[PDB]
Amino acid sequence: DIPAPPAPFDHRIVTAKQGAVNSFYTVSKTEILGQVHKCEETATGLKLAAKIIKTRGMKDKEEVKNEISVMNQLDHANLIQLYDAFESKNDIVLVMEYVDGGELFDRIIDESYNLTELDTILFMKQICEGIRHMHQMYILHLDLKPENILCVNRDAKQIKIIDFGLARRYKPREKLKVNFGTPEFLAPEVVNYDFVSFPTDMWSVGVIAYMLLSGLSPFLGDNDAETLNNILACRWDLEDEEFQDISEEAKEFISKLLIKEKSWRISASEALKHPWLSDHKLHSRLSAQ
Numbered sequence: 001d002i003p004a005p006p007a008p009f010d011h012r013i014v015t016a017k018q019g020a021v022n023s024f025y026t027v028s029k030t031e032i033l034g035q036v037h038k039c040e041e042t043a044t045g046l047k048l049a050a051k052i053i054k055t056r057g058m059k060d061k062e063e064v065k066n067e068i069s070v071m072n073q074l075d076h077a078n079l080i081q082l083y084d085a086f087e088s089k090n091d092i093v094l095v096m097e098y099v100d101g102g103e104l105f106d107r108i109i110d111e112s113y114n115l116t117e118l119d120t121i122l123f124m125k126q127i128c129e130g131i132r133h134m135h136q137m138y139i140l141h142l143d144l145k146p147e148n149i150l151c152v153n154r155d156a157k158q159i160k161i162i163d164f165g166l167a168r169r170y171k172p173r174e175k176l177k178v179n180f181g182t183p184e185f186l187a188p189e190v191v192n193y194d195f196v197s198f199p200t201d202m203w204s205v206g207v208i209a210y211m212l213l214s215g216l217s218p219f220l221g222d223n224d225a226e227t228l229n230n231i232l233a234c235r236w237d238l239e240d241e242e243f244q245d246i247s248e249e250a251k252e253f254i255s256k257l258l259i260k261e262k263s264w265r266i267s268a269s270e271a272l273k274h275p276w277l278s279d280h281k282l283h284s285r286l287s288a289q
């Protein structure tokens with residue numbers, strides 16, 4: 001398929017201004033995107049999105065300023081682009097690229113019965129492209145889940161990663177602070193309070209692939225503790241009836257990502273090179289159907 005259209009502006013090195021977003025942007029009070037408001041640069045008319053991030057402490061503010069700093073290093077059509085930013089006493093506002101007619105990926109997944117395997121393959125190439133770019137820029141996402149991915153267009157199969165709240169430049173000995181409420185997306189290293197790295201994102205890629213193919217969450221149990229049990233036992237399978245009709249390649253792909261031990265997971269770059277995502281004679285057969 002066709003690569004996503006770029007932001008209508010060139011990639012910027014954004015630094016947060018002291019002052020009110022209101023002084024340079026008209027923020028919509030009725031159009032809410034996810035808090036995220038539609039907005040418009042007053043001077044130019046340019047249509048953008050405004051994420052008001054509430055910040056209690058200095059540490060909260062510092063987390064957002066890291067987020068800005070990270071977006072600054074990420075220039076790619078599958079990664080939402082920062083346009084401007086504003087800091088007040090109680091919040092930092094980010095102004096970002098706006099995608100007209102976006103649908104969040106948890107929606108796409110709720111409607112997984114719509115998707116052929118080829119549709120998912122194509123969405124997956126794009127998701128991997130975004131992650132491959134982040135990793136080759138030495139950056140970890142660390143929060144890759146359907147609610148953080150926007151389906152730009154269903155037909156063209158185009159996506160944009162739209163939040164970098166936990167993203168950071170790679171360092172050794174990176175331990176995350178985590179909470180076990182609704183933990184189905186957590187990598188086992190995050191659950192075990194171990195260090196995170198590039199494979200931490202690849203686990204999530206595995207999870208998303210499983211979910212697009214079946215509409216089911218691979219590690220969900222009847223409650224949070226039972227879900228944690230599944231993650232720590234790395235307990236999952238492709239025995240559900242949704243998986244009966246999928247290719248062997250698909251099955252091998254997920255098997256190379258849902259691995260408890262980090263170092264064994266394939267990279268983003270390898271994921272793209274994998275027969276599920278790269279094999280033309282397979283995609284052809286898939287189209288014929």
Ligand SMILES: Cc1nc(N)sc1-c1ccnc(Nc2cccc(-n3oo3)c2)n1
Nearest residue numbers: 033034049097098099101102103104162
């Ligand atoms: C940053 C962000 N966070 C969301 N939850 S949506 C979002 C975002 C950022 C930029 N552009 C858009 N586009 C957009 C436009 C119109 C609707 C919607 N959606 O899903 O509800 C999204 N959405």
